[PDB]
Design a protein around this motif. Structure first.
Motif, PDB file in Angstrom:
ATOM      1  N   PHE A  95       4.455   1.773   5.361  1.00  0.00           N
ATOM      2  CA  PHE A  95       3.723   3.241   4.898  1.00  0.00           C
ATOM      3  C   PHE A  95       4.045   4.251   6.078  1.00  0.00           C
ATOM      4  CE2 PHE A  95      -0.797   4.404   4.882  1.00  0.00           C
ATOM      5  CZ  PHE A  95      -0.662   4.905   3.843  1.00  0.00           C
ATOM      6  N   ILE A  96       3.613   4.336   6.854  1.00  0.00           N
ATOM      7  CA  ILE A  96       3.621   5.267   8.117  1.00  0.00           C
ATOM      8  C   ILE A  96       4.796   6.208   7.902  1.00  0.00           C
ATOM      9  CG2 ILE A  96       3.307   5.910  10.810  1.00  0.00           C
ATOM     10  CD1 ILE A  96       1.072   4.906   9.200  1.00  0.00           C
ATOM     11  N   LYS A  97       5.544   5.799   7.628  1.00  0.00           N
ATOM     12  CA  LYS A  97       7.438   6.279   7.909  1.00  0.00           C
ATOM     13  C   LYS A  97       7.185   7.894   6.152  1.00  0.00           C
ATOM     14  CE  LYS A  97       9.632   3.138   9.093  1.00  0.00           C
ATOM     15  NZ  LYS A  97      10.903   1.952   9.659  1.00  0.00           N
ATOM     16  N   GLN A  98       6.764   6.892   5.205  1.00  0.00           N
ATOM     17  CA  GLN A  98       7.099   6.958   4.281  1.00  0.00           C
ATOM     18  C   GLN A  98       6.050   8.420   4.393  1.00  0.00           C
ATOM     19  OE1 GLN A  98       8.574   7.082   1.854  1.00  0.00           O
ATOM     20  NE2 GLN A  98      10.246   4.375   1.976  1.00  0.00           N
ATOM     21  N   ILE A  99       4.484   8.411   4.160  1.00  0.00           N
ATOM     22  CA  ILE A  99       3.869   9.416   4.051  1.00  0.00           C
ATOM     23  C   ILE A  99       3.985  10.002   5.001  1.00  0.00           C
ATOM     24  CG2 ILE A  99       1.722   9.553   4.419  1.00  0.00           C
ATOM     25  CD1 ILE A  99       2.717   8.178   1.993  1.00  0.00           C
ATOM     26  N   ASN A 100       5.186  10.457   6.169  1.00  0.00           N
ATOM     27  CA  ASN A 100       4.888  11.337   7.263  1.00  0.00           C
ATOM     28  C   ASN A 100       4.156  11.494   8.747  1.00  0.00           C
ATOM     29  OD1 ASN A 100       7.409  13.041   7.981  1.00  0.00           O
ATOM     30  ND2 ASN A 100       5.723  14.639   7.790  1.00  0.00           N
ATOM     31  N   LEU A 101       3.350  10.263   8.859  1.00  0.00           N
ATOM     32  CA  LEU A 101       1.457  10.493   9.595  1.00  0.00           C
ATOM     33  C   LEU A 101       2.406   9.364  10.557  1.00  0.00           C
ATOM     34  CD1 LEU A 101      -0.978  11.062   7.413  1.00  0.00           C
ATOM     35  CD2 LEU A 101       0.561  12.553   9.494  1.00  0.00           C
ATOM     36  N   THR A 102       0.955   9.667  12.202  1.00  0.00           N
ATOM     37  CA  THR A 102       1.125   8.648  13.157  1.00  0.00           C
ATOM     38  C   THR A 102       0.365   7.485  12.449  1.00  0.00           C
ATOM     39  OG1 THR A 102       0.417   8.170  15.473  1.00  0.00           O
ATOM     40  CG2 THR A 102      -0.246  10.361  14.206  1.00  0.00           C
ATOM     41  N   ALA A 103       0.467   6.615  13.251  1.00  0.00           N
ATOM     42  CA  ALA A 103      -0.314   5.065  12.790  1.00  0.00           C
ATOM     43  C   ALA A 103      -1.692   5.634  12.718  1.00  0.00           C
ATOM     44  CB  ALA A 103       0.447   4.297  13.644  1.00  0.00           C
ATOM     45  N   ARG A 104      -1.909   6.431  13.816  1.00  0.00           N
ATOM     46  CA  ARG A 104      -3.953   6.669  14.072  1.00  0.00           C
ATOM     47  C   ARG A 104      -3.886   7.664  12.453  1.00  0.00           C
ATOM     48  NH1 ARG A 104      -4.891  11.944  16.451  1.00  0.00           N
ATOM     49  NH2 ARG A 104      -6.740  10.200  17.139  1.00  0.00           N
ATOM     50  N   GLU A 105      -3.197   8.753  12.332  1.00  0.00           N
ATOM     51  CA  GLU A 105      -3.570   9.214  11.765  1.00  0.00           C
ATOM     52  C   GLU A 105      -3.474   8.850  10.101  1.00  0.00           C
ATOM     53  OE1 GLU A 105      -4.367  12.712  10.222  1.00  0.00           O
ATOM     54  OE2 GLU A 105      -4.781  12.759  12.339  1.00  0.00           O
ATOM     55  N   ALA A 106      -2.881   7.798   9.649  1.00  0.00           N
ATOM     56  CA  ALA A 106      -3.206   7.254   8.630  1.00  0.00           C
ATOM     57  C   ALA A 106      -4.064   5.944   8.163  1.00  0.00           C
ATOM     58  CB  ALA A 106      -2.088   6.258   8.562  1.00  0.00           C
ATOM     59  N   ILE A 107      -4.627   5.598   9.606  1.00  0.00           N
ATOM     60  CA  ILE A 107      -5.699   4.868   9.609  1.00  0.00           C
ATOM     61  C   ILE A 107      -7.004   5.849   9.673  1.00  0.00           C
ATOM     62  CG2 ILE A 107      -6.837   2.445  10.869  1.00  0.00           C
ATOM     63  CD1 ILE A 107      -4.775   2.287  12.172  1.00  0.00           C
ATOM     64  N   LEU A 108      -7.001   6.693  10.007  1.00  0.00           N
ATOM     65  CA  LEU A 108      -7.920   7.806   9.193  1.00  0.00           C
ATOM     66  C   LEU A 108      -8.447   8.501   7.481  1.00  0.00           C
ATOM     67  CD1 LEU A 108      -7.197  10.357  12.517  1.00  0.00           C
ATOM     68  CD2 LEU A 108      -9.083   9.114  12.392  1.00  0.00           C
ATOM     69  N   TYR A 109      -7.316   8.113   7.105  1.00  0.00           N
ATOM     70  CA  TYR A 109      -7.523   7.999   5.581  1.00  0.00           C
ATOM     71  C   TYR A 109      -7.672   6.768   4.943  1.00  0.00           C
ATOM     72  CZ  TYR A 109      -4.956  12.425   6.246  1.00  0.00           C
ATOM     73  OH  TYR A 109      -5.066  14.357   6.243  1.00  0.00           O
ATOM     74  N   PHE A 110      -8.653   5.654   6.205  1.00  0.00           N
ATOM     75  CA  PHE A 110      -9.034   4.609   5.483  1.00  0.00           C
ATOM     76  C   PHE A 110     -10.026   4.520   5.205  1.00  0.00           C
ATOM     77  CE2 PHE A 110      -4.786   1.275   6.695  1.00  0.00           C
ATOM     78  CZ  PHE A 110      -3.761   2.802   6.014  1.00  0.00           C
ATOM     79  N   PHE A 111     -11.040   4.935   4.479  1.00  0.00           N
ATOM     80  CA  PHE A 111     -12.135   5.301   4.457  1.00  0.00           C
ATOM     81  C   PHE A 111     -12.902   4.127   4.059  1.00  0.00           C
ATOM     82  CE2 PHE A 111     -11.143   9.525   3.185  1.00  0.00           C
ATOM     83  CZ  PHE A 111     -10.358  10.054   4.556  1.00  0.00           C
ATOM     84  N   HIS A 112     -12.676   3.166   4.287  1.00  0.00           N
ATOM     85  CA  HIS A 112     -13.634   1.520   4.140  1.00  0.00           C
ATOM     86  C   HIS A 112     -14.386   0.695   5.428  1.00  0.00           C
ATOM     87  CE1 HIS A 112     -15.435  -1.567   1.628  1.00  0.00           C
ATOM     88  NE2 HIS A 112     -14.955  -0.535   0.318  1.00  0.00           N
ATOM     89  N   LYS A 113     -14.750  -0.056   4.501  1.00  0.00           N
ATOM     90  CA  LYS A 113     -15.489  -1.068   5.720  1.00  0.00           C
ATOM     91  C   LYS A 113     -14.694  -2.270   5.569  1.00  0.00           C
ATOM     92  CE  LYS A 113     -20.122  -1.585   5.521  1.00  0.00           C
ATOM     93  NZ  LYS A 113     -21.386  -1.799   5.222  1.00  0.00           N
TER      94      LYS A 113
END
Length: 200
Positions: A95-113
């Motif tokens: 998912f990280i590679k397809q989306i062209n983001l760094t692992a950290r940057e992706a988890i910022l987009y995970f907006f849920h408890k």
RNA sequence: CCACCAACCCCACACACCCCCCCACCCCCACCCACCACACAAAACCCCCAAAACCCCCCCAACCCCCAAACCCCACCAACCCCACCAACCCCACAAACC
């Protein structure tokens, strides 16, 4: 035995015929003629459950990955052991590679408890995820595993979000992945809709 | 392509009346591990010797044009509705009749 499941069949026979062709052609010799492999599989359908048999496939798979051999093509049977029961983690890296983001940057987009427990579970230190050849890639096949904390079911919320985004982007792999029903798929599909909209 | 009298729902014993029901039940859900009908690696145009590339080309040539005389698949004559026996014609009529 591992690829046993519903609606397979023609795929299982195709894998079996391809396996026979590898092993009936040099450097291998034809010892079983044709269709014998399918008939033994019918009697050995659940042989994957047996721990020593799985352990041995994991051992061969680790050796053939690091060391090239003439009969390295035996790895075709043992390729499945690699990263076994870690689909959640593997789905995350892709998912990280397809989306062209760094692992950290992706988890910022995970907006849920719900994601919190899972993010902590999958990124637990002390596991050689980064090491190219390690016991970790075959830990599930060999010992010292238990239930894998990287299985799609354990990291279900994250897995569902990844693949809802992938479906939004039309990735066939996600379209065919089996959704984790327990891990709030509807909410995940909504978040996946927004994320996919951003990335598509 | 009305008619037997008469009766004139192809109504009607009673009890009845969901082509409901034993109970527990009630996803044609669920062993575990899993969970792309993904995957040996190397690698991926069902690309590739060169020399090449109109399924172009001998030449003469090039209307599937041409003896000549000709040229309506016209013409004996008589003709010329694929009209015509007369009587004449609704493929009308015994009578009684005529859903």
């Amino acid at each position: 035995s591992k690829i046993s499941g519903q609606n397979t069949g023609n795929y299982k026979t195709n894998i079996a015929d391809r396996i026979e062709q590898i092993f009936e052609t040099a450097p291998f010799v034809k010892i079983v003629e044709h269709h014998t492999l399918m008939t033994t599989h019918k009697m050995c359908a659940n042989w994957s459950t047996i721990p020593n048999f799985r352990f041995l496939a994991g051992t061969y798979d680790m050796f053939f990955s690091r060391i090239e051999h003439l009969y390295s093509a035996i790895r075709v049977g043992t390729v499945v052991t690699a990263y076994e029961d870690c689909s959640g983690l593997v789905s995350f890296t892709g998912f990280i590679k397809q989306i062209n983001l760094t692992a950290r940057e992706a988890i910022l987009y995970f907006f849920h408890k719900n994601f919190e427990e899972e993010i902590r579970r999958m990124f637990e230190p002390g596991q050689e995820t980064a090491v190219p050849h390690s016991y970790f890639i075959h830990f599930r096949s060999l010992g010292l595993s238990g239930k894998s904390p990287y299985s799609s079911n354990a990291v279900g919320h994250v897995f569902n979000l990844i693949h809802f985004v992938g479906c939004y982007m039309g990735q066939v792999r996600s379209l065919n992945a089996t959704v984790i029903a327990a891990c709030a798929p509807h909410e995940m599909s909504v978040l996946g809709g927004y994320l996919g909209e951003e990335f598509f």
